[PDB]
């Protein structure tokens with residue numbers, strides 16, 4: 401079976417064709433514009449191929465409750481045209497094959513869970529740190545989907561007492577995303593994050609904030625592997641700060657090697673690199689195919 | 695089938711006999727002392743009855759990984775004799791019937807999930823606020839058990855800027871438990887919490903801290919019902935503060951009635967009152983019985 405994947409982002413769309421084992425056969429990308437024109441490009445790209453199912457990993461928040469009238473829509477976004485657009489249903493109507501749906505970060509979690517750092521485990525957490533901060537979690541082999549999908553980027557961690565930055569988040573100001581996203585780093589220090597790579601205090605601070613968030617996730621969810629991706633995490637030096645800070649914050653409370661001596665194999669970059677998300681959309685496609693047949 | 699339950703606490707043990715539908719037939723309690731003598735009382739109480747299975751809901755942290763060599767032990771505690779005592783195995787050796795094991799707060803979650811405020815849902819979160827703070831979560835109808843059971847009481851929420859109290863927690867100082875447990879309230883204000891019922895600012899502050907914790911849990915786990923029990927939550931006025939503060943902290947980020955207009959039916963006291971835990975131990979017993987037969 402050939403499967404289609406759509407990783408829908410605020411800035412670009414990535415579409416791919418691939419197989420259930422996560423092999424990417426072909427891909428394309430294009431800028432995100434209004435939904436009708438953007439989706440028409442998707443349909444035109446897939447028109448070349450004979451696909452059995454598609455999966456969509458979308459920027460959110462989204463309505464990921466399959467029982468909901470608004471399932472398969474983006475529920476909050478400043479991007480023009482996208483909130484409440486019938487994203488999933490338009491792709492189902494055009495393509496006439498099964499279509500899976502999830503957040504983009506859920507897709508990345510599935511990619512690492514099946515083919516990456518969590519292969520063989522029954523739990524993991526994938527976090528991206530880029531334009532925003534978001535996370536997807538697998539619990540007992542299934543994506544975590546409660547009242548909502550998680551919005552773990554918006555938790556309120558403690559400000560560093562020397563950090564004077566007010567925060568980037570339009571909703572909360574200095575939530576984790578507001579303090580530690582790519583744009584927050586840029587707004588705080590006055591240059592883009594990639595151009596601050598030689599300024600240690602930038603990454604100390606970023607590592608401190610990420611470590612505070614991870615301690616909360618460890619105490620609440622206790623995932624068996626934590627995978628950190630996104631633009632900001634291309635600054636690999638951040639990991640060393642995280643590994644120093646997490647044990648200080650937890651202060652020996654939970655006696656596991658993952659959280660102390662072997663933390664460097666617990667909190668890791670994605671095995672699939674920057675492709676975890678798009679590969680995960682193929683998993684969503686395969687799931688949707690199997691569910692239709694059942 | 696008659697089932698036995700053991701709710702093991704730091705101060706007292708509660709033992710009960712009951713049925714799979716959560717009916718309590720009989721109960722006894724006694725102070726927690728050293729483990730051999732305490733467990734001998736358990737065995738002597740159950741000796742009267744013909745039981746098919748037992749469930750243990752223990753104060754933790756515990757090792758709740760069934761594949762672990764140290765499964766069914768308490769892994770951290772200042773109480774003399776308890777850390778690493780073979781609690782589960784001693785009860786299995788003496789009783790010679792199936793024995794279930796979990797944290798005490800996991801038991802309370804099961805009680806409310808089957809017989810209480812979450813009956814009919816597939817997700818919930820039970821939090822106790824007493825001598826410590828702890829929580830158990832049900833996800834897709836099963837207790838959440840990752841690398842560890844959750845230790846949600848120890849997350850680091852933001853101090854109120856006018857609160858000068860250093861915090862009660864021996865590990866973290868001013869983690870949620872350190873700021874908002876019963877003993878923290880007493881140490882901060884100089885009287886026991888029950889004797890401060892007429893001092894509004896005590897409960898404003900407590901509501902503010904609990905609300906901050908709940909916002910984090912909502913963003914990370916997104917449970918479909920939040921149940922708040924424990925000694926401190928006998929001060930029912932705390933709920934009204936929580937209902938005012940949660941929406942301010944979230945600032946309309948997640949559009950669900952549970953988090954706004956209908957928050958008073960989302961964050962609730964236990965339907966089972968102070969018996970959620972002991973009833974939950976009967977559910978652990980029934981589970982252990984069924985698992986043996988399978």
Ligand SMILES: Nc1ncnc2c1ncn2[C@@H]1O[C@H](COP(=O)(O)OP(=O)(O)O)[C@@H](O)[C@H]1O
Pocket residue numbers: 409411528529530531532581582583586592593594630631632633634635
């Ligand atoms: N190599 C890098 N090092 C540090 N920051 C980066 C790097 N690449 C991108 N960024 C920053 O990360 C953010 C973009 O995140 P990214 O994961 O690339 O995309 P998006 O989150 O929009 O899908 C921007 O703030 C950008 O400046």
Ligand SMILES: Nc1ncnc2c1ncn2[C@@H]1O[C@H](COP(=O)(O)OP(=O)(O)O)[C@@H](O)[C@H]1O
Pocket residue numbers: 703705822823824825826875876877880886887888924925926927928929
């Ligand atoms: N009715 C009450 N109102 C406020 N605080 C209470 C009340 N009862 C007990 N407390 C406080 O809660 C803590 C005890 O918690 P509780 O849930 O009764 O027991 P435990 O956590 O030890 O099982 C103590 O700090 C106690 O002073």
Ligand SMILES: [Zn+2]
Pocket residue numbers: 553554555569570571572573575576577578
């Ligand atoms: Zn935010």
Ligand SMILES: [Zn+2]
Pocket residue numbers: 847848849863864865866867869870871872
């Ligand atoms: Zn603590």
